[PDB]
Amino acid sequence: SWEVGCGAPVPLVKCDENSPYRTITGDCNNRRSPALGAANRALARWLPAEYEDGLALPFGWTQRKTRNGFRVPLAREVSNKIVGYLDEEGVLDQNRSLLFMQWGQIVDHDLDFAPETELGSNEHSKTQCEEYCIQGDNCFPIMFPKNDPKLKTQGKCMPFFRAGFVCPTPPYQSLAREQINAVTSFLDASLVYGSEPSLASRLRNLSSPLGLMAVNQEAWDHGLAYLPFNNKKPSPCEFINTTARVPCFLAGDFRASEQILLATAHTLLLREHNRLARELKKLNPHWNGEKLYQEARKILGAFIQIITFRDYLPIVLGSEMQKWIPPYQGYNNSVDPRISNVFTFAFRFGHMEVPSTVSRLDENYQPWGPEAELPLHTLFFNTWRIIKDGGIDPLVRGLLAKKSKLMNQDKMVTSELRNKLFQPTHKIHGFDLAAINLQRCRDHGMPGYNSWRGFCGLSQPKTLKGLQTVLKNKILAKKLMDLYKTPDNIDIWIGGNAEPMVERGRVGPLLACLLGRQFQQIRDGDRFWWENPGVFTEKQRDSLQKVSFSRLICDNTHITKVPLHAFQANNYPHDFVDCSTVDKLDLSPWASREN
Ligand code: HEM
Ligand SMILES: *[C@@H]1O[C@H](CO)[C@@H](O[C@@H]2O[C@H](CO)[C@@H](O)[C@H](O)[C@H]2NC(C)=O)[C@H](O)[C@H]1NC(C)=O
Ligand SMILES: *[C@@H]1O[C@H](CO)[C@@H](O)[C@H](O)[C@H]1NC(C)=O
Ligand SMILES: *[C@@H]1O[C@H](CO)[C@@H](O)[C@H](O)[C@H]1NC(C)=O
Ligand SMILES: *[C@@H]1O[C@H](CO)[C@@H](O)[C@H](O)[C@H]1NC(C)=O
Ligand SMILES: [Ca+2]
Ligand SMILES: [Cl-]
Ligand SMILES: [K+]
Ligand SMILES: [Zn+2]
Ligand SMILES: [Zn+2]
């Protein structure tokens, strides 16, 4: 609320109700309600927002005001007391590859983005926030607690800007602040293509009628394509190594260059689109560029859907997969397709799956050169290590043969993210993602832990003893109670991640329920779901069923050896097979003549 830095450009389109293609914005998916799921609308609220003043001020804004009669603990202080740990030994997930973590970030970026308020460029507001740690309007700084080492080294706070929100509209009667989702709620490869028509065009190759995406014209990966550079300045990716001065990539998603392995995945996906287009041009020489672009975009969309539901969700949701996502029963035009506010915090479980280092491996999956293993923080906004240090293949190999971090109640978020995160506007490897997540929960008016437990029909701990029983962990419960006084006040991000994981899964009960429900809706509420009859032919669906991430790698790199199950932990060579033995996508069902 209170208008400063609100709104987004929602472009009005008349719906082509008969198009076999998704729109870019996500409009027209739901025929009765064409905006449901579209980009640049409010996140859905599963429960009403909870703000200090009932409208817009986050809990923790006014020093005097309590939450349920208790002060809320500083976000950095929760992080120090609970989230950090020293020893990386034994922290790794023994049955999940690094690809597990990375795929999660990909799915997340496809579904939701809540950009920070653009106070504008040229800001004295940035100055008053960063330099003076002054709370006001969109500046909601993360203040360091007493004895924080960052006090001695960084200042009084980390700057933090409140998320973007829907503008008050002409009733202007009083409503709670609603944050915006800038990307389409459908699992539709929007992170590749854009959620905005203008960028979508700019990303395409329109010089040729071949339906390709634009590729870098200054650099190649042993003949294979790189994303175009983003030429907007100043560039964080340039900042981190001004000698090398390699800019960030330009993708369908703003966040693509945040870390080297995300940039990698974005590259594999772009390569795939162009491969699909070239193949379809071979099968159908008469098809034009629009047709080629749309059809390859349509396939790549389904590819993301299949990998997520067949390979990813089962090993996240474990024993709960069946309870939340039973066999598909066809498109339901009454299901809300929109991403919920709470989901965007629930999906941040992946922050506990990121390890402290990244490795480049050679063709024998051995350490590549003398600086094979790098600390994670050196790779935020890092495109030079790709362009000028060996391409994507060495990184892809580590994705396959290295492991995700396991979530650990005693070892939650690695120091690389908890102390050394680099933010694109700022200049220091000095931020705390865990403190940011907690602050952001408050920013977004998140109801508290016991609110969500109830939403999910789970017991709601009220005492230390009750929480110890929920957490199966005495010390964690006690530290939580000392900080929060009441489990009612525990911020949803820390609360949900504190729970021991469900059987065969990588999240606890509360999170399994929140994620499960959202993924159910994402499938059932999508008119272009790949399994919705008429979206693909039957023969095409039979082809699609054979897609795998291993094939994507084989088709789009010079790696010739891959595991069959890329998401589990795999060791070279025993678990790797030659690419020739891996199922391909058969495109013959897309062949199209007139006779
Ligand atoms: C750097 C960051 C990562 C890797 C080194 C990383 C990783 C993940 C995974 C694996 C996720 C899902 C399984 C995931 C989800 C979401 N993230 Fe997170 N992430 C890195 C950095 C960030 C930053 C910075 C943010 C913004 C924090 C803020 O509130 O201002 C961030 C957010 C999220 C998020 C909310 C929406 C979004 O931007 O993705 C997730 C669902 N991540 N990340
Ligand atoms: C857009 O598509 C055209 C045509 O495929 C690309 O042009 C060719 O690019 C390759 C690689 O640079 C060359 O080997 C060919 O000789 C080029 N042929 C033509 C028709 O010029 C062009 O590079 C693509 N543009 C972008 C920006 O991705
Ligand atoms: C790793 O997880 C997958 C889950 O589908 C399972 O099939 C595989 O056997 C697991 N390996 C283990 C638990 O060691
Ligand atoms: C910057 O890149 C150059 C090569 O471009 C390299 O030799 C140097 O180590 C890099 N410096 C930093 C700051 O990482
Ligand atoms: C579809 O959606 C609504 C709300 O989820 C539900 O009541 C209804 O039972 C569903 N109908 C079918 C046919 O699945
Ligand atoms: Ca999307
Ligand atoms: Cl919500
Ligand atoms: K993110
Ligand atoms: Zn090569
Ligand atoms: Zn700064």
mmCIF file of C-alpha atoms in Angstrom, residues 20 42 62 71 100 102 133 161 236 245 279 301 437 441 544 574 580:
data_model
loop_
_atom_site.group_PDB
_atom_site.id
_atom_site.type_symbol
_atom_site.label_atom_id
_atom_site.label_comp_id
_atom_site.label_asym_id
_atom_site.label_seq_id
_atom_site.Cartn_x
_atom_site.Cartn_y
_atom_site.Cartn_z
ATOM 1 C CA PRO A 20 -2.777 -23.996 -30.316
ATOM 2 C CA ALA A 42 -0.810 -10.282 -7.712
ATOM 3 C CA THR A 62 7.851 -0.689 14.446
ATOM 4 C CA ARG A 71 8.931 -8.795 19.776
ATOM 5 C CA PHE A 100 18.802 -31.990 -8.151
ATOM 6 C CA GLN A 102 19.849 -26.857 -9.953
ATOM 7 C CA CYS A 133 20.453 2.188 7.156
ATOM 8 C CA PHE A 161 14.129 -3.188 -0.618
ATOM 9 C CA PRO A 236 27.374 -6.977 -12.001
ATOM 10 C CA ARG A 245 34.810 -7.830 -18.330
ATOM 11 C CA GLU A 279 15.137 -30.604 -36.788
ATOM 12 C CA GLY A 301 7.592 -26.456 -22.530
ATOM 13 C CA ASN A 437 14.399 -14.906 3.161
ATOM 14 C CA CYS A 441 8.556 -13.356 4.578
ATOM 15 C CA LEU A 544 7.639 -37.105 -25.407
ATOM 16 C CA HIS A 574 30.314 -47.303 -13.080
ATOM 17 C CA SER A 580 24.233 -43.977 -27.992
#
